[PDB]
Amino acid sequence: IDLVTAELGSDWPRLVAPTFDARKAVVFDDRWASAREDLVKLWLAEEX
Amino acid sequence: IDLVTAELGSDWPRLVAPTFDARKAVVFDDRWASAREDLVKLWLAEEX
């Protein structure tokens, strides 16, 4: 492991560490909810 | 070391092993010796 590090360097092994996992995903399929709140904000704040 | 191997593969660490060492070098600076043996071989074997 010392020899492998000697060739590749310090940053390469540390940055190659895994990140992605299947449980942290977030899905936004709602327009219906966000469109309603979007309109009432326009309606109340109307100036121009 | 298992994670590092997982990324890079099996062949990469094994082929990257060191080879060169300063003590195995071989120097041929002699023409004077090799030219003499070269001529006598011609002289004896002359046909054409």
Q: Which two tokens stand for residue B25?
A: 């070098």
Experimentally, how was this structure solved? Answer: cryo-EM
Nearest CA distance, B37 vs chain A (angstrom) = 46
- DSSP annotation of B48 reads -
Nearest CA distance, B9 vs chain A (angstrom) = 12
Resolution rounded to one decimal, in angstroms = 7.5
End-to-end Cα, chain A, rounded Å: 66
Question: Measuring CA to CA, how many Å separate B41 from each of A24, A44, B3, B35, B47?
Answer: 81, 108, 62, 10, 12
Distance, C-alpha B6 to centroid of its chain: 34
Task: Return the percent helix, strand and coil in chain B, to nearest 5.
Answer: 55, 0, 45
H-run or E-run covering A22: none
Q: Which two tokens stand for residue A17?
A: 């560490």
CA neighbours within 13 Å on the CB side: how many for A40? 5
Say how many C-beta atoms besides its own lie within 10 A of residue A12's C-beta.
14
Determine contact: B3 vs chain A, CB below 8 A: yes
